[PDB]
Amino acid sequence: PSSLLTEYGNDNICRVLALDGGGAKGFYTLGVLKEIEAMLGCPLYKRFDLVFGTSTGAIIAALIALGYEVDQIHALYTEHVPRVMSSRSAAARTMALQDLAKEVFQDKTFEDVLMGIGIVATRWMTERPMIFKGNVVQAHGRKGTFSPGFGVSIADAVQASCSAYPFFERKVIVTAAGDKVELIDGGYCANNPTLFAIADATVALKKDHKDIRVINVGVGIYPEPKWLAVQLLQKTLEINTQSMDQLRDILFKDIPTIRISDTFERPEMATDLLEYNLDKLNTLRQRGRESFGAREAQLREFLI
Amino acid sequence: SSLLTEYGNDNICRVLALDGGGAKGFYTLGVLKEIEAMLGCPLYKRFDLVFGTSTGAIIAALIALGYEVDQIHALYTEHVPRVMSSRSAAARTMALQDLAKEVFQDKTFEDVLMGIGIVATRWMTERPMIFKGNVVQAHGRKGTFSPGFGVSIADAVQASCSAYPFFERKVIVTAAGDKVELIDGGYCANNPTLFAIADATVALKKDHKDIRVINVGVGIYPEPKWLAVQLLQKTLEINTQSMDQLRDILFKDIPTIRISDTFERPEMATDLLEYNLDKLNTLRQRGRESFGAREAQLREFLI
Amino acid sequence: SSLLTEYGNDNICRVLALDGGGAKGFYTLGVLKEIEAMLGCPLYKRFDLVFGTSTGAIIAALIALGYEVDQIHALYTEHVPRVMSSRSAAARTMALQDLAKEVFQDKTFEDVLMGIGIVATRWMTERPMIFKGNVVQAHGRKGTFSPGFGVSIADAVQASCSAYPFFERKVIVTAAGDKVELIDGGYCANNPTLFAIADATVALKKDHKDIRVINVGVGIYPEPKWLAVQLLQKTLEINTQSMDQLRDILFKDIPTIRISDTFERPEMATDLLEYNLDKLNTLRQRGRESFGAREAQLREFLI
Amino acid sequence: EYGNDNICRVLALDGGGAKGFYTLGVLKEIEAMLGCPLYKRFDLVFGTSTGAIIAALIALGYEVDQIHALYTEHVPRVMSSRSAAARTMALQDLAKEVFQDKTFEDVLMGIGIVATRWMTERPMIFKGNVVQAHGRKGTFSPGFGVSIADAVQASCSAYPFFERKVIVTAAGDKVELIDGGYCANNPTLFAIADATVALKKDHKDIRVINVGVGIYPEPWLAVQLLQKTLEINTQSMDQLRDILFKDIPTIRISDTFERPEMATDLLEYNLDKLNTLRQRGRESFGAREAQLREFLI
């Protein structure tokens, strides 16, 4: 039943795929990825060596690392994601998100992957990023007592990264060693995991800078549709996601990188954690495909 | 007048990154007190590069001009009780501007004796603004480089200490004429440790194993609708911890020494905006003993 | 098993001295769990000496018998959260006596596989009482040396774990039939690090360059909430804070590593009466991350 | 006698309450068999509470003849105060009488006073020589730049009876101290740590003449849950010295008495009973005369 029958030989060049976090804006990510596999003609896990999605990557990265194809990812996304954001609450949203992770990821763990994976979350008590992984070669410290995915299924590891404090309740995690960790959304610490993934493919799995091909895929920038100290909250988050893209620009310059995210200006865009109109989201998917065509010349050079 | 010993040229390039505190800057003065006494020479003769946030900038600028630690302590114990005593946002920023007028009036980023870097993120681009001292410390756009954006040190250092919730956003006019607006330099990086290592490796052609980082913090102390304020205090903490947790991942093989201890007794409940010279003096004593626990390690770094 | 690493015998003597603070021993289990996994073997195959105190007595003995850290945690989480639930100080003693009977049924100080020592204070003479394991660890009166004072290893632990204001006073009967009155061992020395260096220099006379002392504490936490009560708690702090200040002057050429971190947030507030199973869990992982910051220097002493 | 013999004879003095007449009688018999003042046949002098007063006076001048004179006049007065605050003012008055304006600069021998801090909770030891500290050299001002009149008053501040003396160091930081009895009521061990690690002396080069005050009988559970911990620290530190420094020739002069008529209450303002302690203690020297003159030569 497979329609992609292309075989690419092994090489000494790593290819990293770093997805960003946008919530319900993942349709822009599905649009650009749907034409990336078409240029390759093969499943994505057969060409890439590392995927590091954050909150939305948690979803698309976990599905890509299992061996899914973008047609199947898009089918599940349009059917269930608009149902999650339909409830205006914090407990009711976590209840619905609980079943979505259960139906798509039944019982699989971080040993059923076919490539290097990593999901970003945030510890609420010590304020440090919690990065799930799949292999012991990606760890930097404490080589002993290493348990892939902390012995936790994909159902909880992804849902924990999706607990957006302002919209979702907090998520508790029980490690294989009995540790009861409480987590929240992974965006608060890093919303653009490009800096982490490059640090993952440079310290662990030591490779040269000239032998890495990083491809970042955002969600695009959109105009926004009682300032009780809430303006600062919005500002400190933007200052946080900014100055990181500025940081990796100074630290990693000799590493070829491509970012796919276009800014929109006309008053026809809206927020993400409240958009549930099928027609509204359908327009974002087409905009992502157009953004691919303008850069198809360079993407063919890297992905070959 | 008493410090006279001199040190020859050396290939190892040290670096001093000063944390950004507040009225708790006495801890940093206590730590640096024995460090200069142990060396026996002014700080600008041994260190090759200094980066500081708001509190640290006041000390970083004065060290770069030639002020000794005892002189900085004199200027600190005299004026601080005033600016921290006002009960208005426009009152604190007004008196703080007069203080900068008296310590240094006709001084820009050209009279400094060493490499300096002062942090401040903006209000429109949401990116840092790092006032450097020399053209070699830049990364790009090395065709239009005025040493310090043409701005004087008086209003440059004031911009770093502009905590928006309690101060007013300092508006700066550069030499080119671009009206830039900045806020407290601790909103993007409360600790310039990572920046100092970045500005010393990809900017200055120096490999690892030849860099000694000395991050002199200020110490952690207890504290004496509410949905947004709790989240604001926590988000500022995540960026503080995520930045150091990222530093030891990349630059793990770089010899670093962080001097900042923690205290848990309720009698030391120091917070921001402190003016009582009693509690502010005890914190200076704590900074003196923290050097005693790590003296046997620092002697290899500073020789 | 899954721990099948065999290390060759060398002249270096590795000492491990545990502290005691009550139900906060989970910090010690979290650190020791990472040290065992780093070695790949039980702890009694690499160390030559292990001491303990009010809590150490429970972990120092189990390590000398041959147990594993994964097994000690498999016991410390089913009875320790139970003994602290008793209301009276007498019921807290009737319960602790049954536990040693079920874990140390018949073993004495003769079937140990390393150098053991437990600290306890006499009530009349008011001096330390150290239950040694071998005659080579004595400093006089070797003619009448009886290992463990002829007392079972189950009774020599209930003494150190008997705080007078919270438990009863434990009286023992040694081999010579001497009814000795004992109390908790945290009154003369809560950190036996100075005792351990004292026991590896005059007895088993090694040089100062051939000892690697590894101290493990239980961390420091704020209070979760008269005149003599204040002085009672005040004098205990002066005793322990001046003892480690004394060994720093005496033994400085001896490499030491202390693993203890200070906590100040109002959520990490505990004492030696905690019985909340969830609150005890967070203290366990708090010590594990404390090992990660020091993993690069621990591997230098013990491979 | 002779100038130097490469021997580091230390003199650790204990202390507590008005019972210091004992060590006065013991010291009075000494300095007589020698013929020279005490500051000439000694290289180090430590003292915590009462010996501290005796430590300074020997280290800067007058001998035992004048010390007992200053002790028999003023001491019976400061103890005759019912309020806790009055004892501090009178004790401060006594300080400015004999210690008018002298500091730690005009001391003729190595001295050390013991007083524990109230905040950091660890001893604070005043010294008077450049080579007397083990670390943190530099920023080293002899005696913290504080006058002897205030350094000794701090070392004599029993908090339940006196008031916590506040000292302003020459650097400018105010330090809150209490007596040196809460940390170490016996500077014998501290004298070995300073004479061996700092002065770098061998293990058979020093002689330790520790002079006590003697043990005497006595005339809510926290009251007697407090005196006990204070003596556990005194006994535990004594035994630890025997373990580490068994090869150190020491001579402790402190006898015990069980007679009921010898019961003191640490604050006896009585001239007839404080004289018996001065008598009983002139004979304690006679029981070790044939041994002491091998140490002091």
Ligand SMILES: Nc1ncnc2c1ncn2[C@@H]1O[C@@H]2COP(=O)(O)O[C@H]3[C@@H](O)[C@H](n4ccc(=O)[nH]c4=O)O[C@@H]3COP(=O)(O)O[C@H]2[C@H]1O
């Ligand atoms: N690429 C990165 N970019 C930015 N930050 C990163 C990155 N990688 C790690 N960190 C941060 O550094 C801290 C220590 O990482 P270490 O690799 O040194 O040790 C790891 C490993 O040994 C083990 N482990 C990891 C993954 C897994 O699936 N199973 C598993 O067992 O647990 C520790 C993880 O704990 P956290 O993840 O909670 O903390 C991390 C993270 O905050």
Ligand SMILES: Nc1ncnc2c1ncn2[C@@H]1O[C@@H]2COP(=O)(O)O[C@H]3[C@@H](O)[C@H](n4ccc(=O)[nH]c4=O)O[C@@H]3COP(=O)(O)O[C@H]2[C@H]1O
């Ligand atoms: N170590 C670091 N880690 C992380 N980010 C860093 C670091 N260092 C700089 N940056 C960020 O990189 C952005 C661009 O810096 P560039 O060095 O590439 O070009 C500089 C220079 O050519 C010129 N110039 C600089 C200093 C001066 O006194 N006069 C002057 O004229 O202006 C540009 C300054 O712009 P900003 O300072 O506003 O923004 C910076 C900063 O946010």
Ligand SMILES: Nc1ncnc2c1ncn2[C@@H]1O[C@@H]2COP(=O)(O)O[C@H]3[C@@H](O)[C@H](n4ccc(=O)[nH]c4=O)O[C@@H]3COP(=O)(O)O[C@H]2[C@H]1O
């Ligand atoms: N490292 C140290 N640092 C500081 N002080 C230390 C240290 N080690 C010991 N001490 C103290 O020195 C005191 C005298 O000990 P001794 O060695 O001179 O004689 C011992 C021994 O011969 C015998 N005996 C000992 C243990 C046993 O299991 N069976 C057994 O029979 O009983 C005597 C009484 O021992 P305690 O242990 O009760 O009292 C000790 C201790 O308080």
Ligand SMILES: Nc1ncnc2c1ncn2[C@@H]1O[C@@H]2COP(=O)(O)O[C@H]3[C@@H](O)[C@H](n4ccc(=O)[nH]c4=O)O[C@@H]3COP(=O)(O)O[C@H]2[C@H]1O
């Ligand atoms: N024999 C001992 N046994 C047990 N503990 C001991 C012993 N000796 C010292 N200590 C402890 O060691 C801690 C730090 O001592 P340091 O030697 O490292 O530096 C000294 C010195 O350089 C300088 N200074 C000293 C004397 C003076 O008249 N003016 C002056 O300026 O101040 C520091 C004093 O501080 P504290 O005295 O408050 O604390 C001491 C003490 O608690």
